[PDB]
């Protein structure tokens, strides 16, 4: 969809910390994902058409495509859960983020029911 690409583009800037338009490892590790260095050079090698190794946004999306998505969203929630109870706390969301008051304002604005924490059934609503 035309919306989903724009959402990915905003996410792409969290990969493009330098702001130039070009790292994957740095954020992939920091997002708390084990997979080492060997596989990254191999994965980039499918979209880099000019050989430059320059990472461009149109490359990013195609590089992500496969020939199951519902479980990916559920796995994304598990990236927020440090322990894995079913709720995300202010201290949990602060971990993925790296002011504390701003994190509280961020937590409260998602909490639809009123528990002071964010569960999956409401984590999806925010995303779409």
């Amino acid at each position: 969809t035309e919306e989903q690409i724009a959402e990915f583009k905003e996410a792409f800037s969290l990969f493009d910390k330098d702001g130039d338009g070009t790292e994957l490892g740095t954020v992939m590790r920091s997002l708390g994902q084990n997979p080492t260095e060997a596989e990254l050079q191999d994965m980039i090698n499918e979209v880099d058409a000019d050989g430059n190794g320059t990472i461009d946004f149109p490359e990013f999306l195609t590089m992500m495509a496969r020939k199951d998505s519902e479980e990916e969203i559920r796995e994304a929630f598990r990236v927020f859960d440090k322990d894995g109870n079913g709720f995300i706390s202010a201290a949990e969301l602060r971990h993925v983020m790296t002011t504390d008051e701003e994190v509280d304002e961020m937590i409260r604005e998602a909490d639809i029911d009123g528990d002071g924490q964010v569960n999956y059934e409401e984590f999806v609503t925010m995303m779409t």
């Binding site: 954020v27 969203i73 990236v79 983020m97 998602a110």
Partner: peptide, 25 residues
């Protein structure tokens, strides 16, 4: 607030997909 959420949300999905692609290769 809706952006900051969606940004880190979609970025989390981004890593899930990247990791999935690796296994897929």
């Amino acid at each position: 607030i809706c952006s900051r959420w969606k940004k880190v949300q979609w970025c989390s999905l981004s890593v899930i997909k990247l990791k999935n692609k690796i296994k897929y290769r």
